[PDB]
Amino acid sequence: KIFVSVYNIQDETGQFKPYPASNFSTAVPQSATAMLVTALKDSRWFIPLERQGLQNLLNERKIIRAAQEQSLTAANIMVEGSIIGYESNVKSGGVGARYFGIGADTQYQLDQIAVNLRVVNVSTGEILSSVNTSKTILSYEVQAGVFRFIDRLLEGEVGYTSNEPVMLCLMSAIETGVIFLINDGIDRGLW
Amino acid sequence: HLPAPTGKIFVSVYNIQDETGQFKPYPASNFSTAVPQSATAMLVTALKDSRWFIPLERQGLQNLLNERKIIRAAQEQSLTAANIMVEGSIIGYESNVKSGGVGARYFGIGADTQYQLDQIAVNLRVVNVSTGEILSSVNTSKTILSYEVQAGVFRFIDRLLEGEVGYTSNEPVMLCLMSAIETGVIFLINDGIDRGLW
Amino acid sequence: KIFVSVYNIQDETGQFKPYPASNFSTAVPQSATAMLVTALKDSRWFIPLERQGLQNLLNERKIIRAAQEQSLTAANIMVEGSIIGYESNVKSGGVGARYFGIGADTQYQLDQIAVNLRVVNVSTGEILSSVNTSKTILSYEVQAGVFRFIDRLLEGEVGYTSNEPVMLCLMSAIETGVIFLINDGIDRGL
Amino acid sequence: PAPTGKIFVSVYNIQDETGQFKPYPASNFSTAVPQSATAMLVTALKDSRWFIPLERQGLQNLLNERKIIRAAQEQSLTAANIMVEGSIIGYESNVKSGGVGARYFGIGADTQYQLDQIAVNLRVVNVSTGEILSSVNTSKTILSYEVQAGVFRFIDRLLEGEVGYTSNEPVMLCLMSAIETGVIFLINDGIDRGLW
Amino acid sequence: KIFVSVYNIQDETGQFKPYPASNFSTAVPQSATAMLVTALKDSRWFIPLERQGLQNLLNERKIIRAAQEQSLTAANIMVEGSIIGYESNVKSGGVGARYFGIGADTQYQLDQIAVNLRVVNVSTGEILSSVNTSKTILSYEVQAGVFRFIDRLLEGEVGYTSNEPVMLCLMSAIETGVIFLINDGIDRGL
Amino acid sequence: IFVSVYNIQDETGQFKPYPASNFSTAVPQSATAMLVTALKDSRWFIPLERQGLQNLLNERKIIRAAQEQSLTAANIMVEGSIIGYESNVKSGGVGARYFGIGADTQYQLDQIAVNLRVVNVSTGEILSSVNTSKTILSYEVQAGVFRFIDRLLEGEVGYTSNEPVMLCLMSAIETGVIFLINDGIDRGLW
Amino acid sequence: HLPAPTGKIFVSVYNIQDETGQFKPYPASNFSTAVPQSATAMLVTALKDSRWFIPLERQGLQNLLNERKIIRAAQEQSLTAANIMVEGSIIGYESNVKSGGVGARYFGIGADTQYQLDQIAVNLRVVNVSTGEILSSVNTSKTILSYEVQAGVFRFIDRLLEGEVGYTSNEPVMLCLMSAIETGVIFLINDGIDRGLW
Amino acid sequence: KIFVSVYNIQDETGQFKPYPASNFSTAVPQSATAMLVTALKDSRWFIPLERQGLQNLLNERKIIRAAQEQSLTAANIMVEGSIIGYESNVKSGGVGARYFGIGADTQYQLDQIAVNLRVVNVSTGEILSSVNTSKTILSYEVQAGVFRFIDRLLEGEVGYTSNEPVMLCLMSAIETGVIFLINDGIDRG
Amino acid sequence: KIFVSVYNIQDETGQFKPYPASNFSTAVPQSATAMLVTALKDSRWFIPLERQGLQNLLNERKIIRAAQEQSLTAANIMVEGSIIGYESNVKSGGVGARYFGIGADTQYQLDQIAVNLRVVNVSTGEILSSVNTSKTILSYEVQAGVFRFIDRLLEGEVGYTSNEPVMLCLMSAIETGVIFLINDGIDRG
Predict the structure, then answer these.
(1) In chain D, how many domains are there?
(2) Residue A21: closest CA among chain B residues belongs to which residue?
(3) Which of E71, F16, I10, I76 is the most buried (most CB within 10 A)?
(4) Where in the sequence is the domain holding H79, given as residue range(s)?
């Protein structure tokens, strides 16, 4: 097991959802340094050190020390970085056709998320590695309908829509990123 | 084979925060979050109800410290610590994820139905207080259903006739958050069962 | 009687009314630590200790102490918690029908509010109990109308709407919550 | 009821905990309820006299003025053994609402009404022990109505006419009212204590 | 003459003009502690003490003291208070009629402004009096028009609108308020 | 003859309506310039700066530094603020159209009020205060022709005038200074 | 008769600020000022160009003080003052003030024109540094023209013919501001000449 | 290898996406001082020194020093600079034609991004070099459709749109900036 | 070569883009004090001194000074100033005509940007020079189209639009400004 310290990884995408959404709602989750710490945890051996999160821990230790009137493990490597970018439509498109009286159509869009992870040495402060990974986010819509006349009338509609969970894609990106960092570390080795 | 625990464990939880960065869309107020700010209550009541575990407050800590100031003053008696700390946050929220619906209209009786699913994710981390090492962590995800059903009639006589009926249901996102945090707490409690920490 | 201290119970619902309303107008009242303090007061025996509210009291005591040139009771239990959640439509629906020429219709929506109360020990700082309770908020509209032709013409409309007072439902929730807190203490007993 | 006697009551602030604002067309910054309590309340306590409101609004200017006085000379400040606290608890609408109307050729007429609710919380607190001696919630309701009548007639030429009237009870008055019954309730409640 | 010191009287109406107006513009002027100071000035005997306004005066005195390298009169009573409330439509209404081809119509609205003034003693800090006064604000619009056919065509329009000056009504309320305060003080008498 | 003026601020609490930006005031922020030049142009008076004072103090810091000589005071201080702004107050207009020549006209009035107060520097007593108010005219005129031939003919002419609110502010501040000086003649202090 | 000056005068100008409180209307961003923030540059270059006058910076002063911190630091030599200080601000802005336009259309050739005038006012004050007394002040006002011209043709043949030509001009509010500050500086300079300050 | 310390490179474009987008959404990524740090990392010889990022490193070292009751490498040159500008439409255009009953059309837009990088000496604080580079950002849309009558009716639509990843163009720009910087440094040296 | 120190040249235009754009988006880049630093660098003789930018430099030197348990060159001149103004339409206009069935049209707008530079003496704090320069910003649109009837139908459309890169024009203005300052120094000297 190797002790890894990670404090914060930002959303540097600087992006927000368009209308109808609230102009306050980010296009990307604020959750990394959770995603990342659990990615390091689940890829074990790595032993995540918290530091989120550090203030509370320090308070708790203050309470402990107060109750009695005993040390805190460090990390030789630190992971840093942020969420590099988000956009759309990137690649997007769709088709459709309507004949009397049955129409049908379909649409799709792709999005991009990029992430940067950096392994930095704690002793020398040198950056031992850094990587950019980018996943893509699918969205699609399918519709079919029927408009027919008799005389009286008839009509019908069916439809389905899917959005890949940006949070899941982020998780994917940070995981493949950690895989890459570990792999890169194997040729170092530091281990 | 067989596992076994021993006794109650004091757990301190300060903030489990909303890292979703999300807010409801229009018509809603752009200030209204898509997700409750209420965890570190949901979680604290999960730990209280999942006993044996003993939540240590710390929300919440300052008011207590003040009250202790009043006590110490009025008399002119220590404060128990927690050996584990739970942390984490609400990892994410989105929509439509999966969504869709169908409908049909024949003269003169129409009907239709629609539905949407949403997702919320939560992260819980058990961290050791002495060494500051993270002992465990889990990501959990619930989904949030919404659906609408409508039926109607347009008919001519000569005179005329029409009618409408409809029903809608939205799963309570707060309940879904709670459900998620329960799933996470169950997961953590078993991992500790195989450890044991106890 | 037991002295109970309550400082802040907060709105953690993070919700605001939709349009036409002002985006600054909360979906839920800010009034708890009053509603709750009066709930504890009214179920007495409990003796709410203020602390809202505390600063003014401290100033007033400064003034007294100056004018005289006599202590301040504490509480062994503290109540905490907040308003956990709010939403809508949750469940909603309605029906209606129109035949010549008399139409009628009706609608309803239900909402939810949840609350958390926690009894915490002041001495050791341990949480003695915590409970979540949730009420629901009814709203409905009724309309009836007539459209008739003669030659000349005739029409008429009547309607009524009712919305349950979200504030009252909050009071209800906090009250039932006070009941649950009171009960678990009975087997404690403290 | 009855005075004695006079009791010094200090009130610093009673605040709007309603968190409510007027809807469109109004400005989203415009509160649904007045910020004027701790005036309304001070005058309510005053008008029910005996009570002797002690200011504390307001205290900063008074202390500055005393600085000026003390400066001109190069004499104390009475305190209150009770403190009144509390806030504006809640506001809404439509709560209860409705209306009717009918039109025959060519004379139409109609009327509508809405009720709103305002709630207040007052708490009498002991200054010496810091104990809350009482707390009360009162709620008034706010009436509004609109009336219209009209005529559309044809001759051939044409004729039309309209008349209308609307009244909205002054929310500020209902707040004052609420705090007034609240002061009454507080006084009565104190009557059996008695502390006074 | 009696020296009266007045520092702050602020807008507690929490109200703002509706659309089309800018959402930042108050429904009520911020000018009180002037209107009041000039009202007391005009009601003489009273001698307004500034204190607005005080910081600048203190600076100026710093400069005076600096140039020379003579005291500052106080007030035994202080006036306080604020603008209590504003609303609309309160009472409002109107009529109108149109016959071929001449129409005419009229409308009116009333608004309300309330004020609170309090006389407080500077020595004891006791409130010697407090009063709430409320004026109302009139507005009306009148129109007349003609639509006629010849064959060709004819039309005409005339209209007038008047809105009472909210600032003036604030002044009216603050003045009548001053009358109430003096009136109450005379039976004291101090 | 030395007059010191630090503050005159916008207490109108008003902003322009739509189409304008909600950040744009209905009234200039410029007084303590208008007023200082009004006192200057009305001489005898000698404006003492103090806007504006901080920069000067820095400059004197520099002078004093380069050398390793005093600063004149004022026995009277002028104070006050912009009391109010409104519209439509009085407004109206007419128009008529006959085939094919139409014409029409409209007008609106506004109000601006200002308060000036002379305050004594030694005793801090207010020696005088006045409210003065100007009014602001706006008008529009249009004329047009719609005619058919068979083909067609049409034409339009129009003119609009808005009195410069800033200028009206200047006017109010000047008449105010006139009044203050005049009343001062019977004091006189001068 | 005859006047006369002597020598260069050191003038310090810290801030000349926008007191207009005005912003462009829609379509523009509500954050966009109706008037430039650039005076105390415009004015400083006006004083620089009307030389003899020696603008003293002080904008601007902090960076200068830092650079001198660096200089003084590297060596281990004084700082000139200004005998007069100029102050003032942008007093006001508006529209339509005077505005209007005409136009006519005959078959099938129409034409029309429109115009708007705006105003900017500026205040400059020469203030004495020693006694702090104000030696002079002026209010000046420029006006800002805008106009549009259009011509068009709608004609029928059978088939059809149409045409459009148009031109618009807006005077540069920044130019008008500069012009205003120039007129104020000119006024102040004659006034000082019969003073003299020299 | 030369040790290069880069603290922050900032977005000085002052630009945000237009409607429908949120008025809070930057038109340009905030991600540089990652992009640039990884560009210098990928261009070796260079050894990026962090400094992002520095506070956490310092805290961690505090913890380490606490556990023991061992020094920190510096950089002799520092890279600075920022994202200079962004705009559109800059160049834009498109064509299209529709005949009975088959229509088709296409659009395209270009955007610009500029970047400034500056090599500064740490000892003397002198700017050894500074360069501005600018990439451009392609976007295009294509549609084709058929509207026909029979008697009954028939219609169909197909379309595709591609938008170049502004983040990529930013990366490309910062890389080209690095190339210029290295070129300038070699001629010094 | 002369050492020149430049800290801030700011956007004093107070202007922001109109609708559809975000109300937070400046009409003008925030990039000057880079543009200016690269203009001075490119005009050598001159040696831009950083100072942006200074805090990181001082931190780095803290790291250096700590690692060893060597001075920092000053500038006798400082360049200051700001972006003085931005506007539109200023001059704008256009023509167009349509005959059956072929129409065509074109329109254009001009914008203005002005910049102010000031050379200030560091020793006496006196302003040695200041200049205002202003460039103008062209934008134009061209379109041509055909609507024809047969019976059947026909239509076609082509169009092209260009916007001069406001960032480029600012660069231009700041450059010409640097020229003016250099000349102004030439007769000084």
Answers:
(1) 1
(2) B25
(3) F16
(4) 1-189
